[PDB]
């Protein structure tokens, strides 16, 4: 009922641009953390029996 239109201020565009850079740094960091952990498991542990 009270839907309001969206105003794209210049600050909001800059806000998303800073977030875009942060997400890339986060995605790169998480991938490295995942890759390191996968390598650790292969050498640290083996198969589990009953």
């Amino acid at each position: 009922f009270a839907l309001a239109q969206i105003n794209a201020d210049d600050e909001f565009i800059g806000a998303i641009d800073k977030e875009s850079a942060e997400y890339l740094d986060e995605y790169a960091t998480l991938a490295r953390d995942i890759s390191n952990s996968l390598t650790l498991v292969k050498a640290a542990f083996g198969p589990l029996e009953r």
Binding site: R32, N36, T39, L40, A43, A44
Partner: protein
């Protein structure tokens, strides 16, 4: 640095193996006391006149 961390983790696990155990077995071993005098339990009774 990550490879240094990973290898340290693996090296610690590989050292967790166990070599052997050591213990002293002493059950059933009791000390011995030493008896100086032999009990004879003998008494000599004589008459006053020696009859």
């Amino acid at each position: 640095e990550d490879m240094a961390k990973i290898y340290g983790a693996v090296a610690a696990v590989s050292k967790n193996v166990n070599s052997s155990v050591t213990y002293e077995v002493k059950r059933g071993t009791h000390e011995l006391i030493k008896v100086p005098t032999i009990p004879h339990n003998l008494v000599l009774i004589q008459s006053d006149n020696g009859k």
